[PDB]
Design a protein around this ligand. Structure first.
Ligand SMILES: Nc1nc2c(ncn2[C@@H]2O[C@H](COP(=O)(O)OP(=O)(O)O)[C@@H](O)[C@H]2O)c(=O)[nH]1
Ligand SMILES: O=C([O-])CC(=O)C(=O)O
Ligand SMILES: [Mn+2]
Ligand SMILES: [Mn+2]
Ligand SMILES: [Mn+2]
Ligand code: NA
Length: 613
């Protein structure tokens, strides 16, 4: 009985199964105190002020209620190699790769995990408060919403979860005696500290392990206080666990933005887009269109939960309550709506700070007044000419979604929004045209499966080498990728299903000396215009070996000067021969026995179309 240690709420007021979860882990982790979060403004402000007292965060004086955390440099992003899923059989979690090293997930046996667990969690919260975070993924009363309980010894986690999820007492009241996903987190630094504290950021890099136990409905994360590792509702729950549930239950959990777009004829359509981490999702989702009479509104920027309704419409909700966006590159010119969103009530991690108490990062495009100096993310003085960046490449803002000036009026509608198009894309410097359209659902699933993109700073992958990232979900598959492909393909045999048109984009094609062929950002509205017309049934497409592309003059290029058109839209036989062979060998190695017949067929079909050019 840990009742005596509860400093907010009551164990008696908790639902039966919630009490057992809290108490069992209190027995194991040995916290000094238990704080059951209520999600109130008062709780939030006081916790922020306490972190400020302890030197864990700094207040940003230029803004209304904004804060800055600077981490231990060993804890700065997701670590895919220390992120594991436990199942009875390895093949349920990843396909068995021919080469013996899977690039589609990482499995750990039940036995190996139990040993890892016992080596980490006993006593891990000694001298700390265990915070109990009741959270809902998805709008208030959405039939698509799922609730979790996260236990953590990090106030930083509590604060960020308030922004990124719906959290507090009303969630507990909604849960009742229902099921919840069990999320356990520790920074892994019990008191007294056995190792030095670096930058007042508690973490345990050597023992970092982010584990998922779908058959137990548990997420268990140790050693990292950073975003994707510690905010367990986001990647761990809403993608890894949820994708598996989605498979089981007939829906989809995807690494997708959702946006609403209205044309000059007063018609609105919703689109979803899957681009890899740090490949343009947030920027597209809250785009400021350059084309007159067009408007974009943001439903979500990162995760989509989608389910076909009784009428056959693919209805989507954003399960998150905030944006956890990449900071560097964000500017008034590139993402004006993000800049407006983050002006108040926002937590920044690993960005720079100006002497005026403002935020700073690479690509902010914000000349500072003479005399204003910069403190880098490492808490050292920094000059514009210096070798290293002022902000970490994976620095983040964590901001309430309700503050986006173009948040969609239906972004919290319980039934969700009807998706009419799904867009795939990544960073490809060569060979891949600005936009093309899949020939069929099956072709579209292949296009998703074949996605490749330059590495980014979102995880541990350095350099810019082109990596396979199918459906932008390589770090996030909750189960066997072959079975995931099967699941997607099965949607075509569901009665009444209105299958969205599928497109592939490339914002990132570079010419022969390394400059972008396409301006992008707000100009991407010209591509969305084309997609919108295609959904409407417009005669605006020409057939090519890779799919449909815009006809001559179909794309609105007015005001864009002499854009190098057939360099941007060029399709080389030699490039695509190479491409298809590479896709072939990848799928054979990585997916093997679990590759759906229909994907192999699309591969064969593409190879044949290419062979005839
Ligand atoms: N050149 C170019 N860069 C972009 C575009 N969209 C986003 N970016 C940059 O890519 C980085 C990550 O963008 P973001 O929208 O946050 O991607 P996300 O992590 O998938 O949400 C930022 O530095 C952006 O400025 C684009 O259309 N063109
Ligand atoms: O790690 C996170 O939570 C941020 C994110 O959305 C990504 O890196 O894809
Ligand atoms: Mn993401
Ligand atoms: Mn982003
Ligand atoms: Mn079929
Ligand atoms: Na710090």
């Amino acid at each position: 009985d840990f009742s005596a240690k509860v400093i907010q709420g009551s164990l008696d007021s908790l639902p039966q199964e919630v009490r057992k979860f809290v108490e069992g882990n209190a027995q194991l982790c040995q916290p000094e105190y238990i704080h059951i979060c209520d999600g109130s403004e008062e709780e939030y402000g006081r916790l922020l002020a306490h972190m400020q007292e302890e030197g864990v965060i700094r207040k940003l004086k230029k803004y209304d209620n904004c804060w800055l955390a600077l981490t231990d440099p060993r804890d700065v992003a997701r670590i895919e190699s220390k992120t594991v899923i436990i199942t009875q059989e390895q093949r349920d979690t990843v396909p068995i790769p021919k080469s013996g090293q899977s690039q589609l997930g990482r499995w750990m046996s039940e036995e190996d995990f139990e040993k890892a667990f016992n080596a980490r969690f006993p006593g891990c919260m000694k001298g700390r408060t265990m915070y109990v975070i009741p959270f809902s993924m998805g709008p208030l009363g959405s039939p698509l919403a799922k609730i979790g309980i996260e236990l953590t010894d990090s106030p930083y986690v509590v604060a960020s979860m308030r922004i990124m999820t719906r959290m507090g007492t009303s969630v507990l009241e909604a849960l009742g005696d229902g099921e919840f996903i069990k999320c356990l987190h520790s920074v892994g630094c019990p008191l007294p500290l056995k190792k030095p504290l670096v930058n007042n950021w508690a973490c345990n890099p050597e023992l970092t392990l982010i584990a998922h136990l779908p058959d137990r409905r548990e997420i268990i994360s140790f050693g990292s206080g950073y975003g994707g590792n510690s905010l367990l509702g986001k990647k761990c729950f809403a993608l890894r666990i949820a994708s598996r549930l989605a498979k089981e239950e007939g829906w989809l959990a995807e690494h997708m933005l959702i946006l609403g777009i209205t044309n000059p004829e007063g018609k609105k359509k919703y689109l979803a887009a899957a681009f890899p981490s740090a490949c343009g999702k947030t920027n597209l989702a809250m785009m400021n269109p350059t084309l007159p009479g067009w408007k974009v509104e943001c439903v979500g920027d990162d995760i989509a939960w989608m389910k076909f309704d009784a009428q056959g419409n693919l209805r989507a909700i954003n399960p998150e309550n905030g944006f956890f966006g990449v900071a560097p590159g964000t500017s008034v010119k590139t993402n004006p709506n993000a800049i407006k969103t983050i002006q108040k009530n926002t937590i920044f991690t690993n960005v720079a700070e100006t002497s005026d108490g403002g935020v700073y990062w690479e690509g902010i495009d914000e000349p500072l007044a003479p005399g204003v100096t910069i403190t880098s993310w490492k808490n050292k003085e920094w000059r514009p000419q210096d070798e290293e960046p002022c902000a970490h490449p994976n620095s983040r803002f964590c901001t309430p979604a309700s503050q986006c000036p173009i948040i969609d009026p239906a972004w919290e509608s319980p039934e969700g929004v009807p998706i009419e198009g799904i867009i795939f894309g990544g960073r490809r410097p060569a060979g891949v045209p600005l936009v093309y359209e899949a020939l069929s659902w099956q072709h579209g699933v292949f296009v998703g499966a074949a996605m490749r993109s330059e590495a980014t700073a979102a995880a541990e992958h350095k350099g810019k080498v082109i990596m396979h990232d199918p459906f932008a979900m390589r770090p996030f598959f909750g189960y066997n990728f072959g079975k995931y492909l099967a699941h997607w393909l099965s949607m075509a045999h569901r009665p009444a299903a209105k299958l969205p048109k599928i497109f592939h984009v490339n914002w990132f094609r570079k010419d022969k000396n390394g400059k972008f062929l396409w301006p992008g950002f707000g100009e991407n509205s010209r591509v969305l215009e084309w997609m919108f017309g295609r959904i409407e049934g417009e005669d605006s497409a020409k057939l090519t070996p890779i799919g449909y592309v815009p006809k001559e003059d179909a794309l609105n290029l007015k005001g864009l000067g002499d854009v190098n058109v057939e360099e941007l839209f060029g399709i080389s036989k030699e490039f695509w021969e190479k491409e298809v062979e590479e896709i072939d060998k990848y799928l054979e190695d990585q997916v093997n026995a679990d590759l759906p017949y229909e994907i192999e067929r699309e591969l064969r079909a593409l190879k044949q179309r290419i062979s005839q050019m």
